[PDB]
Each structure stands twice: as structure tokens, then as C-alpha cells.
Amino acid sequence: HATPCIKAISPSEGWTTGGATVIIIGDNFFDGLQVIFGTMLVWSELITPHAIRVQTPPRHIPGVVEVTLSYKSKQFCKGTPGRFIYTALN
Amino acid sequence: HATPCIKAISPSEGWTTGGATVIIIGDNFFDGLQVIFGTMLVWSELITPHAIRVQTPPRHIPGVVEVTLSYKSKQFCKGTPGRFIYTALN
Ligand code: EMC
Numbered sequence: 720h721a722t723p724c725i726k727a728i729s730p731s732e733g734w735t736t737g738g739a740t741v742i743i744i745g746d747n748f749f750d751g752l753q754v755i756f757g758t759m760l761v762w763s764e765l766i767t768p769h770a771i772r773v774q775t776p777p778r779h780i781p782g783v784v785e786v787t788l789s790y791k792s793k794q795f796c797k798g799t800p801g802r803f804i805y806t807a808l809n
Numbered sequence: 810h811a812t813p814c815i816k817a818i819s820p821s822e823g824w825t826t827g828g829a830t831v832i833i834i835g836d837n838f839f840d841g842l843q844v845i846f847g848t849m850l851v852w853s854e855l856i857t858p859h860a861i862r863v864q865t866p867p868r869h870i871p872g873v874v875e876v877t878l879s880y881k882s883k884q885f886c887k888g889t890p891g892r893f894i895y896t897a898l899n
């Protein structure tokens with residue numbers, strides 16, 4: 720299908736303080752594609768039609784989150800969500 | 810420990826004629842790092858310590874290649890190399 724799809728993300732770990740640049744790669748990306756990162760909608764930008772750059776949001780609490788894709792307030796469910804582990808320095 | 814390594818490549822397939830923009834994600838990337846497509850070495854452009862950008866070199870014959878990294882004429886090899894598949898239009 721031509722539905723947006725995440726292959727992998729790097730880095731897949733980051734501090735709770737956030738702000739680190741994450742690259743999401745996969746299939747069928749387009750400008751306007753929204754990225755949802757631990758439930759927060761983040762600013763994003765296509766590097767190519769196969770790569771997206773986002774900054775990690777801050778997160779109150781350490782642990783695994785999902786990275787998913789959405790457009791016009793409607794999420795896509797093709798494939799496997801990106802997985803990102805927040806860690807606390809503290 | 811601090812060694813450049815490939816997690817994934819997007820897209821992982823290209824035409825034998827080369828020139829395609831490819832994003833490679835991983836860890837420990839830096840300025841001046843080079844990429845080997847089977848036997849062909851190309852330059853990269855750093856995006857973050859976790860992603861680089863290359864243009865695929867042409868390959869005379871279609872097929873699967875191992876993708877590895879290099880710096881100062883010295884190839885790295887940590888973990889599982891990347892896989893890129895050349896396809897012919899003909
Ligand atoms: C299911 C391939 Hg991004």
C-alpha cells in the first residue's frame with residue numbers, strides 16, 4: 720500500500736529532558752505527515768520521501784513510548800510503531 | 810565503544826544507475842565518514858550522530874551488496890553490515 724509506515728528510528732533512546740534530533744525512516748512519507756511521539760504531536764520535516772526529522776519532546780517520566788504517524792487528525796496503523804526509550808539522568 | 814555502525818538504510822533498494830539519495834541511520838556518525846556500497850566508496854553528509862546522507866554509486870550489475878563504513882581509508886566493521894539491493898530498469 721501507499722500508507723505511511725515506519726521502518727526504524729535513530730536514536731531510539733534519549734534523556735527525559737528532550738530536544739534531541741530523531742530521524743524516522745520508512746515508506747510513503749509526504750509533507751504534512753504528522754508525527755506522534757509519546758502521545759505528543761511534534762514539529763517534523765521531511766528530509767527525503769523516506770526520512771523525517773523531529774525533536775524529542777521532554778517527558779516527565781522515564782520509559783518506553785511509541786512513535787506513530789498521523790494526518791488530518793487521523794492515525795495510520797500500517798506496520799509497527801517506532802519505539803523510543805526515555806531515560807532519566809537523575 | 811564509540812564505533813560507527815549501521816542500524817538501517819532508507820530506501821534499501823535502488824537502480825543500478827545510482828544517484829539516489831539514501832539515508833543511513835545508526836550510531837556514532839561524524840563529519841568525513843564514508844560509506845562503501847559493496848566495493849564503491851562514496852562521501853556522506855552528516856545529519857545527526859545517528860543519521861547520514863549519501864548518493865548511491867552506480868553498479869554495473871544488479872544484486873545485493875553489503876554496506877559498510879570507512880574513514881581515512883580504514884574500514885570499520887561492528888555488528889551486522891547494511892544491505893542494499895541494486896535493480897536494473899532493463
Ligand atoms: C511494512 C513495511 Hg514500513
Ligand code: EMC
Nearest residue numbers: 787794795796797
Ligand atoms: C493502534 C492502532 Hg493506529
Ligand code: EMC
Nearest residue numbers: 814815816836888
Ligand atoms: C551496535 C550496532 Hg549500531
Ligand code: EMC
Nearest residue numbers: 886887888889890
Ligand atoms: C562481516 C561482519 Hg563486521
